[PDB]
Amino acid sequence: GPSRVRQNFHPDSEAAINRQINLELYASYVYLSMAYYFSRDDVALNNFSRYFLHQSREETEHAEKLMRLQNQRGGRIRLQDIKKPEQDDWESGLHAMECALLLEKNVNQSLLELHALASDKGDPHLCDFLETYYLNEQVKSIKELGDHVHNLVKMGAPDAGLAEYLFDTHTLG
């Protein structure tokens, strides 16, 4: 108290990073839920399942990088409960993709708020960290999900019998 490493690291930034860690862990859990929805016997879209599982693992990596940042800067990780996702039944491939797009935009907004706080506190290391490892990746993820939503809508998902199947086998395959 303080850490022998701590420098130019505001307590508000430390707290905001703890909040972001929880949100990335929550996102990981939402994608985990989606992954195992798509491997139900009455859904059986294995490539949607693999897509969401990969996204889940990426979110865990994002959480871990923030935990490492907390330690690097001499802050103290404070974990909270990881809330369950809003649904177990994700209804359709299109619905899951739409929910994932909304989740990614919400996480993006949180990251932009974190960056604005880091700017306000004159913490260029934290600003650079978010820019280098988070902001670019979030924009790419949002774009990819937007693309997938568009194709599924155009193809006639969820009601058109062939749309999610063909998307599963071509795009996600």
What phi and psi values does residue 166 have, to the nearest 5 degrees? -70, -35
* Interface pick for Cl ion out of 11, 124, 161, 173 (rule CB under 5 A): 124
Q: For 51, how many CA atoms within 13 A lie in the half-sphere containing its CB?
A: 22
Known binder of ligand: residue 86?
no
Residue of 23, 100, 103, 149 interacting with a second copy (CB under 8 A): 149
SS (H, E, C) 87-142: CCCCCCHHHHHHHHHHHHHHHHHHHHHHHHHHHHCCCHHHHHHHHHHHHHHHHHHH
As a whole number of angstroms, the distance between CA 117 and CA 155 comes to 42
Kindly state whether residue 54 participates in binding a second copy, applying the rule CB under 8 A: no
Give the binding range for Cl ion (CB under 5 A) out of 51-59, 79-87, 131-139, 156-164: 79-87
Is 60 in contact with 25 (CB distance < 8 Å)?
Answer: yes
Q: In the complex with Cl ion, which residue's Cβ is closer, 62 or 148?
A: 148
Q: Is 162 in the site for a second copy (CB under 8 A)?
A: yes
24 belongs to an annotated ligand binding site: yes
C-alpha distances out from residue 124 to 7, 77, 80, 128, Å: 12, 21, 27, 6
Of residues 1 through 40, those in contact with Cl ion by CB under 5 A are 6, 9
Of 27, 81, 74, nearest to 54 by C-alpha is: 27
Query: Binding site annotation covers 137?
Result: no
Residue 162 touches which of Cl ion, Mg ion, a second copy, none (CB < 5 to 8 A by kind)? a second copy
Of the ranges 21-29, 43-51, 53-61, 162-170, which one interacts with Mg ion (CB under 5 A)? 21-29
Report the interface residues with Cl ion, using CB under 5 A: 6, 9, 44, 80-81, 122, 124, 147-148, 150-151, 153
Residues that bind Mg ion (CB under 5 A): 23
